[PDB]
Design a protein around this ligand. Structure first.
Ligand SMILES: NC(=O)C1=CN([C@@H]2O[C@H](COP(=O)(O)OP(=O)(O)OC[C@H]3O[C@@H](n4cnc5c(N)ncnc54)[C@H](OP(=O)(O)O)[C@@H]3O)[C@@H](O)[C@H]2O)C=CC1
Ligand SMILES: NC(=O)C1=CN([C@@H]2O[C@H](COP(=O)(O)OP(=O)(O)OC[C@H]3O[C@@H](n4cnc5c(N)ncnc54)[C@H](OP(=O)(O)O)[C@@H]3O)[C@@H](O)[C@H]2O)C=CC1
Lengths: 1193, 48
């Protein structure tokens, strides 16, 4: 974006030219600078700005393509006053200056805020912890200097989000005094001082003076260019049974097929059952199903879509098998080539499932008997790297393909002819090792035999359907070995065979030493370049071993292609302890498989794998929830999410929690939901960025008494906490549906008229928008006194409605609100005097018309927000007529001024008693149709107030119930306000932000552990701000590495309050290739991650009964492997085992595998906001280990 | 002076204008102050 101070330089140079001087001798004054639209400089091309000066009027103008950009007054400073730039009298001399922000810390804070300033705009050499005094670097440009002054202004503020200059009241510049104010640092760089004074609203730096700076929230670009791919790391046994037994749709499909088969031997909405029905209508025995036999070949192209046939592919089994294939690949590049692609259609699936791998180079070709088929979807092939080729199973593989890594057939649907020839040709073609992925049906199960019957063609071999032992023996003939099998309920299977590679006797290295002495041994073994004996690591004793990460990190390292691991980690303490010995048969088979990863958990032989996590947002039953716009400006994203009111069981008499039967929608809510209004324009440091919907409700108090109240926000919910001073007692005659409409509209009407306009009987007043709630309340109040009322409406039906509701009105008391014609009406019917009170919720051109209607001694009440927000001019000449221009904002009561509110409360109550306060009309929607209500109000045809029925009303006056009915709202993480939370290494770059997240989510008692304590300005600023907010932060030096340290840390947390959460973010990095590593390096790297987490586990099992969160952060190096981080991998992989073993028992546990963190591999850094949102997602899942990274490009 | 004095107004402030020049010249008045509850009074005792 073009800097706001950039326009200043342009206009300044224009004036200098017009005066015949230069910038270096033209002290200048700006006044009433208004920035209208932000200009977005393009990547290529240029943008043209023209500056026109009205010298006589001392006004300028900046325009772009005929559109106004900036406007204001610029004139020379005739007689500069050097003392104007003196640093204003300060409240504190600030002598100590103990800690301060350096450039890196200040711009890290700014970047977290949203600003992405680069080098040329980085000028704040250092700043105070409050952003009130600083030291600004001086290059020879003014744009950067003034932009840095504005950056200093922004830095110290407490608000969040992106704020940009919109209005400035006065700027004074004096280059001579500026050059007199600069000075040289100990280096050769020039520098100037800056002071920000919020009390006086002035920023002074050198020969510049910014006063009256106004900044307004800017909508986020909603680009969300980062979409992290999220996976779950779960154990996966090599052999599985009943793969799809969980599903019932496939069960119903098979039931229908079984019924059709019984009909044959004793809906047609899916391919296989429809073909079965086609057989049924005819006689299978008669004519040898000649007609159907001809029709049998017709359906084969559409046959694979059958959900029964393609169930295994859709299941995670295919992903697991492909992941196993890629893991054993010696390098990051793989070669795979289909066979019989014209029927298997695996080209669609395999490339997609392998995409999440960040560093996978894939070569794919679809090989078919006849090109006439694969040409059918050639276009659908081009977008992917899938190549083209002609090949037959019986024929030998052309040397073009030759050594192949992976071979996918899907013969379950494709016709493989003779299995012997196909297997022979393939296994010969396959590279030594490699993999042969085959998907075929089986005999000995209903679907297989049914299809076999249906087939009338030899080449399919009944679709090549044999018994499981038949396939196993055939594999035996071709010398392959099975390293994968996945049976399915409906009989389909998924084999994965690996052509063996001859190997010498492996070298076994136990890895159970506690001192990491084996690191020397493994290094020595791997040193030898000329050798191929594969090392087989053993991790038998410690189930908290992390050899998986060690292996992954070492595969990429030199000579790492000869590394295999065997770990025996059983979560259940009562499982069989395997005998892994050179003579043991179990070791014989596991070594025969020639598979890198071999973990034996709870009686099985599998390997950890990755799987894409379900995208659905977790949902839970919950009494307390609120309406949230998960994406601003998209009413279709409305939904119900959990609320912090679930906590706060004890409550002081000052507040009391109330159920919400009917919640109203006011116009502010529509503006917020549509995005036309920011979430920070409302007073009160809400900080949620959402949940600011709803201002009034009608429900029942805790005691069961009926009530209606007004709240600053969060009224659209199933519960609402507020002080009793903002509640009224709905009378017996009315109904809660009616009571929802009274509060806000009548309170604002009374406060505007009686308390501000001090209206009296016999007065004439103009009330705009008569049909609206405020209009109707004002009309009802006015006529009760006995006033004469003019109203403006937008249609004839609204005139009819107002006439029906208010009989006292007459045809002469209505005007038009869509034009400025009402001015003439009011002036004519009033005799030209005008009106006394005016209530104006209207826009610019119409607001001026209202001012012309005021009579002498009139009073203009402004309840709108557009002209006031944009700072439009108001001619003072109207005041020569005795006139009071009021500005009414009812929301000012919630923040402060509680003494005045009781007056409005009493006025409203008196009106309700007397009968003046009569409920408006209500168009009631339901709890599940909140979006419908929002859209209906957006249309604007509503007369009366839209309402939402959260719950129905019982007949009785009092019920003294316990809790409302339970609904289903998106689950989100909130924490009690009476529990403590521990963040090991909480002063690091990540951990301060995790605390900030926790503090925003309710945490009041926090403990941060760090070896060196507070040591930087950023940490001091953060801790001071949190303590000022009222949080009992407490920094401890307890090192969780030793058990004494863990016990002490938990003791401190308990003394502060019961321990609820434990987050371990401690990290010490000692990077290096295996050749340069040492045992002590591994010890140091594993102290905080592996020993600390074990000690936390022990201490929490001993003395933490109310704990609900146990989170430990890992890295993708453990999962995807990384070269030169072996110690990091071993430390992290060992953490995951503890978390997994905690959940099998029942205790909380969760380990996150992050990618790269940006704000504080082949994957881009992930911004902090996305990280925290994804983290909020992960704390609700039922899983153990989870991952999050953003793929490159 | 008048524009400087407006900015001194606090929340729920009240401005009394017993002057006449700025009113007679119909000089502009920024309406952004009314976002703070503020009443602008034009006091003319000649009207009684
Ligand atoms: N700070 C304060 O003191 C408070 C401020 N207010 C403001 O005062 C006003 C009171 O109105 P409110 O109670 O919200 O009533 P509504 O928003 O329900 O109605 C607003 C009025 O504006 C017109 N209108 C409504 N919807 C549309 C639309 N979609 N398109 C065009 N015109 C429309 C109608 O008049 P017409 O028939 O002429 O179309 C209608 O009577 C609002 O501007 C509100 O923001 C309200 C209370 C507190
Ligand atoms: N790119 C990234 O940042 C990624 C990070 N992660 C995860 O995030 C975390 C990194 O934390 P982050 O703050 O960013 O890293 P930093 O290195 O910036 O901070 C680490 C913190 O841990 C503290 N610490 C280390 N060992 C101990 C110990 N024995 N006792 C007490 N405190 C200790 C350090 O104390 P001191 O200040 O004295 O040094 C420091 O405060 C790890 O859990 C890691 O797995 C993983 C993936 C991506």
């Amino acid at each position: 974006l073009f800097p706001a101070t950039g326009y200043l330089s342009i206009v300044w140079k224009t004036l200098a030219r017009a005066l015949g001087l230069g910038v270096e001798q033209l002290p200048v004054v700006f006044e009433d600078v208004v920035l209208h639209q932000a200009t977005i400089l393009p990547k290529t091309g240029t943008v043209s700005l023209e500056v026109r000066l009205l010298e006589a009027s001392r006004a300028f103008e900046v325009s772009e393509n005929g559109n106004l950009v900036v406007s204001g007054k610029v004139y020379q400073w005739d007689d500069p006053d050097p003392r104007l730039f003196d640093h204003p009298e300060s409240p504190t001399p600030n002598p100590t200056e103990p800690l301060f922000l350096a450039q890196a810390e200040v711009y890290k804070e700014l970047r977290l805020r949203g600003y992405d300033y680069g080098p040329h705009f980085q000028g704040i050499l250092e700043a105070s912890l409050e952003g009130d005094s600083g030291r600004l670097l001086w290059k020879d440009n003014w744009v950067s200097f003034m932009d840095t002054m504005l950056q200093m202004s922004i830095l110290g503020s407490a608000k969040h989000g992106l704020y940009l200059p919109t209005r400035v009241t006065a700027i004074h510049i004096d280059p001579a005094t500026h050059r007199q104010k600069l000075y040289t640092l100990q280096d050769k760089a020039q520098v100037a001082d800056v002071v920000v004074s919020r009390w006086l609203r002035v920023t002074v730096a050198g020969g510049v003076h910014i006063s009256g700076l106004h900044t307004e929230s800017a909508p986020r670009r909603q680009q969300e260019q980062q979409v992290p791919i999220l996976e779950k790391f779960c154990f996966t046994p090599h052999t599985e049974e009943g793969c799809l037994s969980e599903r019932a749709a496939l069960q119903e499909e098979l039931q229908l097929c079984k019924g059709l088969v019984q009909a044959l031997q004793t809906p047609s909405q899916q391919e296989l059952p429809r073909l079965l029905s086609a057989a049924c209508r005819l006689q299978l025995n008669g004519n040898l199903q000649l007609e159907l036999a001809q029709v049998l070949a017709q359906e084969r192209p559409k046959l694979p879509e059958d959900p029964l046939l393609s169930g295994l592919l859709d299941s995670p089994a295919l992903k697991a098998c492909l992941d196993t294939a890629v893991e054993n690949m010696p390098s990051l590049k793989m070669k795979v080539v289909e066979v019989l692609a014209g029927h298997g259609h695996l080209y669609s699936r395999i490339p997609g499932l392998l995409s999440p791998h960040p560093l996978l180079q894939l070569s794919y070709t679809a090989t078919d008997r006849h090109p006439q088929a694969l040409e059918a979807a050639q276009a659908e092939l081009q977008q992917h790297d899938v190549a083209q080729g002609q090949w037959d199973p019986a024929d030998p593989a052309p040397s073009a393909l030759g050594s192949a890594d992976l071979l996918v057939c899907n013969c379950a649907v494709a016709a493989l002819g003779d299995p012997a020839s196909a297997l022979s040709n393939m296994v010969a073609a396959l590279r030594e090792g490699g993999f042969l992925l085959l998907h075929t049906l089986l005999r000995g199960h209903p679907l297989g035999d049914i299809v076999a019957f249906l087939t009338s063609t030899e080449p399919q071999y009944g679709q090549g359907i044999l018994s499981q032992d038949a396939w196993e023996s055939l594999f035996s003939r071709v010398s392959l070995r099975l390293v994968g099998l996945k049976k399915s309920f409906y009989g389909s299977t998924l084999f994965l065979c690996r052509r063996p590679t001859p190997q010498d006797s492996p070298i076994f290295l136990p890895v159970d030493d506690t001192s990491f002495r084996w690191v020397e041994s493994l290094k020595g073994i791997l040193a030898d370049e000329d050798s191929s004996r594969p090392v087989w690591l053993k991790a038998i004793n410690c189930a908290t071993s992390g050899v998986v990460g060690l292996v992954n990190c070492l595969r990429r390292e030199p000579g790492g292609n000869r590394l295999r691991c065997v770990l025996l980690s059983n979560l259940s303490s009562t499982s069989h302890v395997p005998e892994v010995d050179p003579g043991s048969a179990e070791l014989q088979k596991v070594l025969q498989g020639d598979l890198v990863m071999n973990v034996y958990r709870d009686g099985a032989w599998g390997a950890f794998r990755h799987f894409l996590l379900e995208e659905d947002k977790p949902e839970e039953p919950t009494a307390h929830a609120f309406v949230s716009t998960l994406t601003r400006g998209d009413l279709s994203s409305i939904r119900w999410v959990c609320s912090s009111l679930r906590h706060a069981q004890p409550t002081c008499p000052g507040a009391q929690l109330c159920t919400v039967y009917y919640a109203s929608l006011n116009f502010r809510d529509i503006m917020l939901a549509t995005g036309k209004l920011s979430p920070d324009a409302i007073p009160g440091k809400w900080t949620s960025q959402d949940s600011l919907l709803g201002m009034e409700f009608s429900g029942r108090d805790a005691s069961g008494k009926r009530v209606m109240g007004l709240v600053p926000a969060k009224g659209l919910a199933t519960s609402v906490l507020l002080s009793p001073d903002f509640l009224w007692d709905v009378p017996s005659n009315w109904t809660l549906e009616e009571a929802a409409s009274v509060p806000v509209v009548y309170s604002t009407a009374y406060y505007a008229l009686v308390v501000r306009g001090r209206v009296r009987p016999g007065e004439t007043l103009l009330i705009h928008s008569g049909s609206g709630g405020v209009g109707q309340a004002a009309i009802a109040i006015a006529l009760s006194l006995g006033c004469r009322v003019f109203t403006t409406v937008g249609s004839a039906e609204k005139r009819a409605y107002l006439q029906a509701r208010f009989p006292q009105l007459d045809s002469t008391s209505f005007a038009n609100s869509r034009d400025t014609s009402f001015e003439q009406h009011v002036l004519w019917h009033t005799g030209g005097k005008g009106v006394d009170l005016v209530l104006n919720s209207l826009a610019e051109e119409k607001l001026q018309a209202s001012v012309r209607c005021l009579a002498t001694h009139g009073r203009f009440l402004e309840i709108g927000k557009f002209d006031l927000s944009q700072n439009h001019p108001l001619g003072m000449a109207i005041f020569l007529k005795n006139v009071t221009f009021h500005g009414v904002l009812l929301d000012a009561f919630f923040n402060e001024s509680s003494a005045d509110w009781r007056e409005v409360w009493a006025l409203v109550q008196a009106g309700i008693r007397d009968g003046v306060v009569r409920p408006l009309k209500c168009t009631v929607f339901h709890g599940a149709q909140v979006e419908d209500a929002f859209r209906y109000m957006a249309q604007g045809k509503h007369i009366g107030k839209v309402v939402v029925q959260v719950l129905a009303e019982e007949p009785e006056a009092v019920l003294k119930g316990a809790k409302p009915k339970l609904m289903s709202a998106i689950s989100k993480t909130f924490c009690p306000a009476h529990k403590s939370y521990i963040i090991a290494g909480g002063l690091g770059g990540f951990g301060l932000e995790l605390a900030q997240w926790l503090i925003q989510r309710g945490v009041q008692k926090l403990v941060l552990t760090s070896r060196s304590g507070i040591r930087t300005g950023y940490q001091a600023k953060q801790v001071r701000r949190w303590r000022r907010q009222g949080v009992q932060v407490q920094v401890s030096t307890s090192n969780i590495s030793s058990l004494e340290g863990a016990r002490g840390l938990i003791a401190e947390a308990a003394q502060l309050g019961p321990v609820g959460g434990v987050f371990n973010l401690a990290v010490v990095l000692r990077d290096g290739l295996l050749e340069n590593q040492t045992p002590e390096f591994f010890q140091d790297v594993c102290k905080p991650k592996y020993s600390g987490t074990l000690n936390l586990d022990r201490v929490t099992r001993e003395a933490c009964p109310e704990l609900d969160y146990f989170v430990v952060f890992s890295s993708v190096s453990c999962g995807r492997g990384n070269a030169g981080q072996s110690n990091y991998g071993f430390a992290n992989s060992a953490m995951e085992r503890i978390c997994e073993k905690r959940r099998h028992e029942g205790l909380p546990g969760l380990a996150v595998q992050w990618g790269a963190i940006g704000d504080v591999s082949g994957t881009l850094p992930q911004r902090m906001a996305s990280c925290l949102e994804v983290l909020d997602l992960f704390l609700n899942q039922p899983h153990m280990v989870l991952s999050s990274f953003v793929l490159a490009e």
